[PDB]
């Protein structure tokens, strides 16, 4: 594949409000984050731009009402239903925060009173009355919880009760017909019948999987903290970038103090694409690009998607990287990436070996544990040899004897550009 999903921190118009959603579709990402304005522009387009050659991105918006959603604006209508039936459409948030938070909506009542009085839910009301947003606001992820209309500024008697309190007192009748002074029908089949800021990304970032984070925007110093976290946390490798002049200079010092745990595997790269809903070029911070260009390959270099310049040759191109460094370059239109690939494949395995410890919990370990464990993991690798990926390609962990221990899975495996052979044990 070689599985690609990536990760998004950045300012959103829209909602959700500071939570990850998996996005799959442009008009998805759209239809939350509602649009991006030039800081958040970049973290919309961050979802399209690679979405078009890309699998799942996870986003992250930076900024009684049960739940305050987030994007949300000011006259974004609300609408009072009655079991999914249109009542009120007229009710408005009205005060938002910074961040879209709802903190103050008005509903007019004039039609739910109405209604309610004309169906018994009043002012009771709450059961089967609902309210949600406008179809849709700008933002996401709010929950405004309907209570009761405000109005502090063969006959039985029935008093239902509820906690003590006299819930509703109502006289019926088990006749038929049988009124009360008001010819309300007082049956009681009746009557009930009817109704009767910078730090904020390195405080979020968090455990969603995936293979790439990227926020581009930081320019420098989200990232080069970020970094320490791509890094930390054995199975999964830590990208990050800035952007170019005075930069390459730069970074070639950054990125040499420091980013290598060789798990972690930084960038050293600002986009021109031409983003289709904002038709326009500006830095659009290439990282993003780069991991639908990452989404693919074996470890990827090749064209760029969608350029239309990135951010020249060649010593600085060549010089860059063994600080994880990539540039782009033209040559007589169409692109190509130049920048022992032998890491991926090597983290991806140890991660991917790892994970079937599930199975060792599953049973015990024995000779034959050796089997079966190692058969599955050698079907694993010789899947990567088959495909591709491995050459010229067990474990033991006690050493050649009769005696055994647990198993440990060391493997030596050879990425297949490479004549070298590493041993790596996961245990």
Same mark, same amino acid.
């Given at each position: 594949?070689?599985?690609?999903?990536?990760?998004?921190?950045?300012?959103?118009?829209?909602?959700?409000?500071?939570?990850?959603?998996?996005?799959?579709?442009?008009?998805?990402?759209?239809?939350?984050?509602?649009?991006?304005?030039?800081?958040?522009?970049?973290?919309?387009?961050?979802?399209?731009?690679?979405?078009?050659?890309?699998? /799942?991105?996870?986003?992250?918006? !930076?900024?009684?009402?049960?739940?305050?959603?987030?994007?949300?604006?000011?006259?974004?209508?609300?609408?009072?239903?009655?079991?999914?039936?249109?009542?009120?459409?007229?009710?408005?948030?009205? #005060?938002?925060?910074?961040?879209?938070?709802?903190?103050?909506?008005?509903?007019?009542?004039?039609?739910?009173?109405?209604? &309610?009085?004309?169906?018994?839910?009043?002012?009771?009301?709450?059961?089967?009355?609902?309210? #949600?947003?406008?179809?849709?606001?700008?933002?996401?992820?709010?929950?405004?919880?309907?209570?009761?209309?405000?109005?502090?500024?063969?006959?039985?008697?029935?008093?239902?009760?509820?906690?003590?309190?006299?819930?509703?007192?109502?006289?019926? !009748? #088990?006749?038929?017909?049988?009124?009360?002074?008001?010819?309300?029908?007082?049956?009681?089949?009746?009557?009930?019948?009817?109704?009767?800021?910078?730090?904020?990304?390195?405080?979020?970032?968090?455990?969603?999987?995936?293979?790439?984070? %990227?926020?581009?925007?930081?320019?420098?110093?989200?990232?080069?903290?970020?970094?320490?976290?791509?890094?930390?946390?054995?199975?999964? /490798?830590?990208?990050?970038?800035?952007?170019?002049?005075?930069?390459?200079?730069?970074?070639?010092?950054?990125?040499?103090?420091?980013?290598?745990?060789?798990?972690?595997?930084?960038?050293?790269?600002?986009?021109?694409?031409?983003?289709?809903?904002?038709?326009?070029?500006?830095?659009?911070?290439?990282?993003?690009?780069?991991?639908?260009?990452?989404?693919?390959?074996?470890?990827?270099?090749?064209?760029?998607?969608?350029?239309?310049?990135?951010?020249?040759?060649? !010593?600085?191109?060549?010089?860059?990287?063994?600080?994880?460094?990539?540039? !782009?370059?033209? #040559?007589?239109? /169409?692109?190509?990436?130049?920048?022992?690939?032998?890491?991926?494949?090597?983290?991806?395995? %140890?991660?991917?070996?790892?994970?079937?410890?599930?199975?060792?919990?599953?049973?015990?370990?024995?000779?034959?544990?050796?089997?079966?464990?190692?058969?599955?993991?050698?079907?694993?690798?010789?899947?990567?040899?088959?495909?591709?990926?491995?050459?010229?390609?067990?474990?033991?962990?006690?050493?050649?004897?009769?005696?055994?221990?647990?198993?440990?899975?060391?493997? &030596?495996?050879?990425?297949?550009?490479?004549?070298?052979?590493?041993?790596?044990?996961?245990?």
């Amino acid at each position: 594949s070689s599985e690609k999903v990536f990760c998004l921190i950045g300012q959103a118009e829209g909602g959700e409000p500071n939570t990850v959603y998996e996005l799959r579709n442009y008009s998805q990402a759209k239809r939350l984050f509602r649009s991006g304005e030039l800081l958040d522009a970049i973290e919309l387009a961050w979802g399209s731009n690679p979405n078009y050659t890309a699998g /799942r991105i996870l986003a992250m918006r !930076i900024e009684l009402k049960i739940t305050s959603k987030i994007y949300g604006n000011v006259a974004n209508n609300i609408q009072v239903g009655l079991e999914k039936n249109t009542l009120s459409d007229s009710l408005r948030l009205r #005060v938002i925060f910074q961040d879209d938070r709802f903190n103050e909506v008005y509903d007019n009542i004039g039609n739910i009173f109405t209604a &309610t009085f004309s169906v018994e839910h009043d002012e009771e009301t709450q059961k089967a009355s609902r309210l #949600v947003l406008k179809v849709g606001d700008q933002e996401v992820k709010s929950y405004d919880l309907t209570g009761g209309a405000y109005d502090y500024t063969a006959v039985y008697v029935k008093a239902v009760f509820g906690d003590l309190e006299k819930q509703t007192a109502y006289n019926g !009748i #088990v006749s038929f017909e049988q009124l009360n002074a008001e010819g309300e029908v007082p049956s009681n089949v009746e009557v009930e019948a009817g109704e009767e800021t910078w730090a904020d990304k390195l405080d979020k970032f968090a455990h969603e999987g995936g293979y790439y984070i %990227v926020p581009l925007s930081s320019k420098q110093s989200v990232h080069a903290e970020v970094a320490s976290f791509v890094k930390e946390r054995e199975p999964m /490798r830590a990208i990050v970038g800035g952007g170019f002049n005075e930069s390459k200079e730069q970074l070639f010092g950054r990125q040499a103090s420091l980013s290598n745990p060789r798990v972690s595997l930084v960038a050293n790269s600002g986009t021109f694409v031409m983003d289709d809903g904002r038709n326009h070029v500006p830095a659009y911070m290439v990282a993003v690009a780069l991991g639908g260009l990452a989404s693919g390959l074996e470890i990827g270099e090749s064209i760029t998607f969608k350029p239309l310049r990135v951010s020249y040759e060649s !010593i600085d191109l060549d010089e860059l990287n063994e600080n994880g460094i990539i540039s !782009i370059e033209f #040559v007589r239109n /169409r692109t190509n990436t130049f920048f022992m690939a032998v890491g991926e494949a090597n983290d991806f395995l %140890v991660s991917e070996l790892k994970v079937q410890l599930e199975q060792f919990i599953g049973t015990r370990t024995i000779n034959t544990s050796a089997s079966i464990i190692k058969d599955f993991i050698q079907s694993y690798l010789g899947r990567k040899k088959r495909d591709n990926e491995i050459q010229d390609f067990p474990a033991e962990d006690v050493q050649v004897i009769v005696e055994g221990n647990e198993a440990r899975i060391s493997m &030596t495996v050879y990425p297949i550009r490479s004549f070298k052979k590493i041993s790596v044990s996961l245990v």
